[PDB]
Each structure stands twice: as C-alpha cells, then as structure tokens.
C-alpha cells in the first residue's frame, strides 16, 4: 500500500506528463520496442515499423501512446482504488492481446526511463521510487486478475 506522499509524487510528475501526452506516449512506446524488440510482435497493428523514425512518423502510434498513458494515468488518480479500471484491461490483455507480466515490467521500466530523462525536477530518487511502488502494486493486482481469468502471465 502507497503512502499520500507517496501518491503525490506520481501525480507531481504525471502532471508533467499531461503537459504533452502524446510525446511522452512516442517516447515509452519507441523506448519499449528498441529495448525489448520482441514486445512489437504482439502489435499486429505495428509491427510492420522498421525504424525508429517510422515510428515517429506513425499517427497511429501516438494515438496508441495517447490511449495507454491516458488509461494508466486514469487508474493513478484512483491511488489504488483501480478495480473497476483494472478489471477491461486485465481481460483484453489476458484473452485478446495475450501480454506476459513480463513485457508489463518492460513497460513499466519504459515509463521510469523516459520520466528519469524528460523529468529531473520531478522524479528524483523519491519519486522514482514512488513511481516504481506504483506500478509494482498495478503488476500485483493485474497478475492476480490474469489468474482469475484463467492466463499464467
Ligand atoms: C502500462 C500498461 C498498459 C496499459 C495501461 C495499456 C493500455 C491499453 C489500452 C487502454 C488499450 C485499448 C483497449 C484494450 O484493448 O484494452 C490497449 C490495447 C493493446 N495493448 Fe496495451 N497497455 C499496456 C501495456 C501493454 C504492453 C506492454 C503490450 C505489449 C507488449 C500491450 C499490448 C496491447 C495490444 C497489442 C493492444 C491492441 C492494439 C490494437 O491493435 O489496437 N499493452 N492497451
Ligand atoms: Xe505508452
Ligand atoms: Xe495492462
Ligand atoms: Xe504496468
Ligand atoms: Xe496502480
């Protein structure tokens, strides 16, 4: 469980991220396919992207971005009160896309990376580890949904 100041430092920095979604969105995404290539496979919508300018040519990738940073960010603001958010996420990943809880910890060192980088003044150790905290608890709780849901992860 988060502490509030804890919870304030995710939302400290996020607040930066909302100044411009969909660049922050290209980032993490491009970040997390030259890190871990493997994880582009499972986007039948993307994978056809060779380069890193392609992607930051592709509309449809930040319009991707802008989705997933706006749906993590929704579940954020409930301070982990996320169950109803969790719950379409959990069974579209499990049943449809088929996301290992492997390539969500990938994400989630994506999202730390691109924050370390782009947001000095906002996520420094504390935050960082605010940050991390947050998306532990997000991997937990999605990791017990996968196996309700019949999904190893
Ligand atoms: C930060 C954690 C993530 C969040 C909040 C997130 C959020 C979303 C949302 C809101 C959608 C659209 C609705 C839906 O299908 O549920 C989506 C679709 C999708 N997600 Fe995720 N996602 C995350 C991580 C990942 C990762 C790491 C992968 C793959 C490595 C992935 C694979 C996909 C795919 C393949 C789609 C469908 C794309 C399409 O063809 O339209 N997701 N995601
Ligand atoms: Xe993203
Ligand atoms: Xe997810
Ligand atoms: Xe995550
Ligand atoms: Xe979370």
Redesign the pocket.
């Known amino acids: 469980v988060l502490s509030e100041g804890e919870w304030q430092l995710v939302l400290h920095v996020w607040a930066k991220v909302e100044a411009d979604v969909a660049g922050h969105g290209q980032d993490i995404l491009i970040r997390?396919f030259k890190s871990?290539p493997?994880?582009?496979?499972?986007?039948?919508?993307?994978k056809h992207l060779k380069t890193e300018a392609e992607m930051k040519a592709s509309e449809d990738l930040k319009k991707?971005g802008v989705?997933?940073?706006?749906?993590?960010g929704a579940?954020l603001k409930k301070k982990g009160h996320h169950e109803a958010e969790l719950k379409?996420?959990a069974?579209?990943?499990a049943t449809?896309?088929k996301?290992?809880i492997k390539?969500?910890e990938?994400?989630?060192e994506?999202?730390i990376h691109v924050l370390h980088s782009r947001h000095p003044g906002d996520f420094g150790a504390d935050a960082q580890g605010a940050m991390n905290k947050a998306?532990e608890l997000?991997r937990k709780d999605?990791a017990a949904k996968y196996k309700e849901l019949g999904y190893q992860g």
């Open positions: 997390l871990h493997e994880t582009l496979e499972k986007f039948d919508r993307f991707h989705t997933v940073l706006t749906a993590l579940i379409p996420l069974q579209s990943h449809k896309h996301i290992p390539y969500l990938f994400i989630s994506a999202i998306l997000f999605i």
